[PDB]
């Protein structure tokens, strides 16, 4: 499991971000959920992004691309999954 250990580790964060996009607990029992909420809240009000040099936005954007390449739903809870698949599906 060379690259597989990394591939399978990314799924932990995808499930945690998907959970956090629906969760309402200010201090949820999941350690990642508490962090994922701070991360989306940052991006929801940032002024830097991938175009200015933001390391946080670019981190969500990678994580969301990994999911959105496979995702095909129009009601998905992750805000960027939609934005990314809408652009990616145009390619051939």
């Amino acid at each position: 499991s060379p690259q597989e250990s990394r591939r399978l580790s990314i799924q932990r964060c995808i499930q945690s971000l998907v959970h956090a996009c629906q969760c309402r607990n200010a201090n949820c029992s999941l350690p990642s959920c508490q962090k994922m909420k701070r991360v989306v809240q940052h991006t929801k009000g940032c002024k830097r992004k991938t175009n200015g040099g933001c390391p946080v936005c670019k981190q969500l954007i990678a994580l969301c691309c990994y999911h959105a390449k496979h995702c095909q739903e129009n009601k998905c809870p992750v805000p960027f999954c939609l934005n990314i698949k809408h652009k990616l599906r145009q390619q051939q």
Partner: protein, 45 residues
């Protein structure tokens, strides 16, 4: 060792460690995503 001549930045904040994914995980994501239209994800066009 660089691609610019700027002596120092003009703005900084503590909002740089919230990072939800590790360098090794991010590298494996970058291999599959291949930066498709990556610097345009916020523009949705």
């Amino acid at each position: 060792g660089s691609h610019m001549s700027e002596v120092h930045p003009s703005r900084l904040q503590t909002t740089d460690n919230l990072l939800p994914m590790s360098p090794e995980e991010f590298d494996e994501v970058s291999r599959i995503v291949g930066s498709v239209e990556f610097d345009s994800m916020m523009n949705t066009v």
